[PDB]
Design a protein around this motif. Structure first.
Motif: not given
Ligand SMILES: [Mg+2]
Lengths: 51, 724
Positions: B286-287, B473, B428-429
């Motif tokens: 996720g972004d 990622e 970011d997560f």
RNA sequence: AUCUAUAAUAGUUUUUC
RNA sequence: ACCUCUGAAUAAACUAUU
RNA sequence: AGUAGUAACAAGAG
């Protein structure tokens, strides 16, 4: 200069595919000036690092 | 047969050839002109994300301020900054309830840090927006100018040397009716006297510019430089956020490198083990969309208020100053624009300070729309930007907020058959969702998304995806059942770094060794990298081998040195010698590697402390990547562009500063080794040291009474000169 | 078994219509 | 016009080295 | 012209 001398067949340059947005006679004159200055540095019996 | 490199992924998994997807051998994109367009776009977009908020006019600066807190709940999936204060407070409360004592202990550590930090902490960094000059300056230069201005205005609490006293001086300066500065021009000095509102606008202003040399972005973006007044408060808030983040397992900050990879792998495997075998597991790569343009300084103030409960008042105030100043911040517009006349063949620079009342015929359609949207916000040459965190600030507090939202995903809080957890690093997560079936996975993802919306976090749908747990990622690290190597990221580090000859050689070999250890750089490729580095090093520094005929300006001297040397292997590559490095000795400095192969006289000349290129002794000048200093540790020339400006007296001033500092070091030998501390002036400290040392030398008989009396007479003369 | 020295330099990471 | 000067430093975290 | 790409260079300053 040596690499240029290794080729025989230099004709009179002429434009084949012109630059549609530019001034092609300037390109012809640029090439002829390059040839003339190569001959000049060849005739000065001491080739410098830069011209 | 048409060659298709991308078809390699049909057999090699993408993570195992991820280096092929980074085209980091060409030059990165740059920004050519102004950054005013990007800054105005950012301001307009930030206010658009909060457009349904409440508008007010600041009583202290006059700037219109938009307040999106407790705004209407969104009805669509568009980005928005309508965070609910009660939801943020509840997220903080549940984070504290899942990790009892985290805020109390973090506050204790941060109180120690606040009480102990010195003012010269502000010099750490490249540039600081100097309000006395309305532009960026070196951090030490900006701090010196600010301190001089404060002293001239009777704000001398920073003389204690503590950072908190400097912050007290900033607060006191905020209440001065008039602040005076000094200006130079074509080189005389002129005094300028700001008024209260003008100084207040300058102190709340962050400079803006474009980010050059950024990889992976098609379009340019704006960045910010904080001013001198806010840096200390931001440092203290970030110290508190760091203390909190160190105690959180989900945090991606402030751990980096192999430690970060190990922590992330351990957290992911712990999540996998805690998961029941009879339930599905999905991970979200996720972004978040425009995290810093949707987060609000008021919510950070609320978080700091909840974190500092039951703390002393002074600590709460010093932590609260930073969000307060950030919610009243102004943004510099930048350079402006350049206008070109085709017929008259002329160009001219339009300052950004004229965009308030400039005719709009010059600009094109998009820029005219930007200016029309942003003109109500323009004040005193800057733009009012109440909502948003500008650029690259409060990253760890953002991490705290994201980790609280992740922590909201325990079964005790979801109160259902699904639960979530994951990793958080600034914005970011990565999210791991567990549920008995796919419906539960969908419900958990929806609940996470809606909770993030409640706290003002917008999950970028077009940049996020979900799959079975095992590959994800996170912060440019690619995980395929474990983090894979990515050599292309470190590829630009290979080459001549540009410090000097010795340092560059050390950097090249150390980079090869580090990439062998970390990024799976094979031995054959390491040898080839060494060869390529040696070639680039010889070409860059004109230090080809002595027994070659590469015609350079330095080739004759190297030929002469090569001829007179007996043992050629002892010569450094900087001196035209051969390369003795291989895989086994990458960790050894070059001078030590071939020390025993050197001629005695060549070695004596090379390692001669009495050489002019480096300032029984040894060569010493800050010796990064330079184990042994030689004549090859020279320093290149500085940029001389400042000689054409009005700031060219700074050169003389810094020359005299260096003279005084070296004289002081003559009195306190440990000053260079460890930074000295003290409220006394330099002349006073030096005189006191001289007096005590002369007394001790007389007592121990190292000097006679006449020399002691002479030193006392000179000290009395210096004391007399000190007052006058 | 534990294990964020301090500081300096360079490098790396961190995108709306 | 000669002449003279000059060839351009975001934030945070991390990593490497000293 | 060309580089280039949301704004610039195609010398600047004294
Ligand atoms: Mg991400």
């Amino acid at each position: 200069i040596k690499c240029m001398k290794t080729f025989f067949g230099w004709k009179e340059p002429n434009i084949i595919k012109p630059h549609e947005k530019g001034i092609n006679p300037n390109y012809l004159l640029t090439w002829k000036q390059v040839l003339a200055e190569l001959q000049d540095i060849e005739n000065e019996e001491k080739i410098p690092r830069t011209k | 047969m048409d060659v298709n490199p991308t078809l390699l992924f049909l057999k090699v998994p993408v993570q195992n050839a991820i280096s092929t997807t980074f085209p980091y051998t060409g030059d990165p994109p740059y920004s050519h002109g102004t950054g005013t367009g990007y800054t105005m776009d950012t301001v307009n977009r930030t206010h658009k994300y909060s457009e349904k908020g409440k508008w007010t006019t600041n009583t202290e600066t006059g700037a219109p301020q938009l307040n999106p807190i407790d705004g209407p709940l969104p009805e669509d999936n568009e980005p928005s900054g309508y965070a609910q204060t009660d939801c943020v407070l509840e997220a903080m409360a549940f984070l504290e309830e899942s990790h009892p004592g985290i805020f109390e202990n973090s506050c204790l550590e941060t109180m120690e840090i606040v009480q102990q930090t010195r003012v010269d902490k502000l010099t750490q960094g490249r540039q600081t927006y100097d309000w006395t000059l309305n532009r960026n300056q070196p951090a030490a230069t900006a701090l010196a100018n600010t301190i001089e201005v404060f002293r001239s205005n009777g704000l001398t609490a920073n003389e204690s040397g503590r950072l908190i006293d400097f912050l007290k001086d900033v607060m006191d300066s905020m209440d001065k009716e008039e602040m005076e500065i000094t200006t130079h021009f074509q080189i005389g000095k002129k005094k300028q006297r700001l008024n209260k509102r003008s100084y207040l606008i300058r102190a709340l202003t962050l400079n803006t510019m474009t980010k050059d040399a950024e990889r992976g972005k098609l379009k340019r973006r704006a960045i910010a430089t904080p001013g001198m007044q806010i840096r200390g408060f931001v440092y203290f808030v970030e110290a508190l956020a760091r203390s909190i983040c160190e105690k959180l397992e989900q945090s991606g900050l402030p751990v980096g490198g192999n430690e970060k990879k190990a922590k992330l792998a351990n957290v992911v495997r712990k999540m996998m083990t805690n998961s029941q075998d009879t339930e599905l597991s999905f991970t979200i790569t996720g972004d978040n969309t425009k995290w810093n343009e949707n987060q609000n300084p008021r919510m950070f103030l609320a978080m700091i208020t909840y974190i500092t409960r039951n703390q002393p008042e002074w600590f709460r105030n010093v932590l609260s100053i930073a969000p307060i100043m950030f919610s009243n911040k102004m943004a510099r517009l930048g350079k402006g624009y350049m206008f070109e006349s085709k017929s008259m063949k002329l160009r001219t620079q339009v300052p950004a300070e004229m965009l308030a009342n400039i005719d709009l015929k010059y600009f094109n359609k998009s820029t005219r729309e930007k200016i029309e949207k942003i003109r109500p916000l323009l004040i005193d040459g800057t733009a009012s930007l109440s909502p948003g965190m500008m650029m690259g600030m409060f990253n760890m507090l953002s991490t705290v907020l994201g980790v609280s939202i992740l922590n909201l995903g325990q079964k005790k809080y979801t109160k259902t058959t699904y639960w979530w957890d994951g990793l958080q690093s600034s914005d970011d997560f990565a999210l791991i969702v567990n549920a008995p079936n796919h419906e539960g996975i969908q419900a958990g993802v929806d609940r996470f998304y809606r909770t993030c919306k409640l706290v003002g976090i917008n999950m970028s749908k077009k940049k996020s995806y979900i799959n079975r747990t095992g590959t994800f990622e996170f912060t440019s690290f690619f995980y395929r059942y474990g983090f894979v190597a990515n050599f292309s990221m470190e590829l630009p580090s290979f080459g001549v770094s540009g410090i000097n000859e010795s340092a560059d050689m050390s950097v090249g070999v150390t980079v090869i060794k580090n990439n062998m250890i970390n990024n799976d750089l094979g031995p054959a490729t390491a040898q080839m990298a060494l060869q390529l580095f040696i070639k680039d090093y010889r070409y860059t520094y004109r230090c080809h081998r002595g027994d070659t005929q590469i015609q350079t300006r330095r080739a004759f001297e190297l030929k002469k040195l090569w001829e007179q040397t007996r043992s050629k292997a002892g010569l450094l590559v900087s001196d035209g010698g051969p390369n003795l490095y291989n895989i086994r000795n990458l960790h050894i400095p070059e001078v030590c590697l071939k020390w025993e192969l050197m001629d005695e006289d060549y070695q004596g000349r090379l390692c001669n402390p009495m050489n002019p290129f480096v300032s029984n002794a040894v060569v010493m000048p800050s010796m990064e990547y330079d184990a042994v200093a030689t004549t090859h540790s020279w320093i290149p020339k500085r940029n001389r562009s400042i000689l054409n400006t009005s700031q060219r007296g700074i050169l003389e001033d810094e020359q005299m500063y260096q003279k005084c500092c070296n004289l002081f070091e003559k009195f306190f030998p440990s000053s260079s080794y460890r930074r000295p501390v003290g409220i006394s002036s330099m002349v006073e400290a030096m005189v006191s040291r001289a007096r005590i040392d002369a007394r001790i030398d007389f007592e121990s008989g190292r000097i006679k009474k006449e020399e002691f009396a002479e030193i006392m007479k000179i000290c009395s003369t210096i004391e007399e000169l000190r007052r006058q």
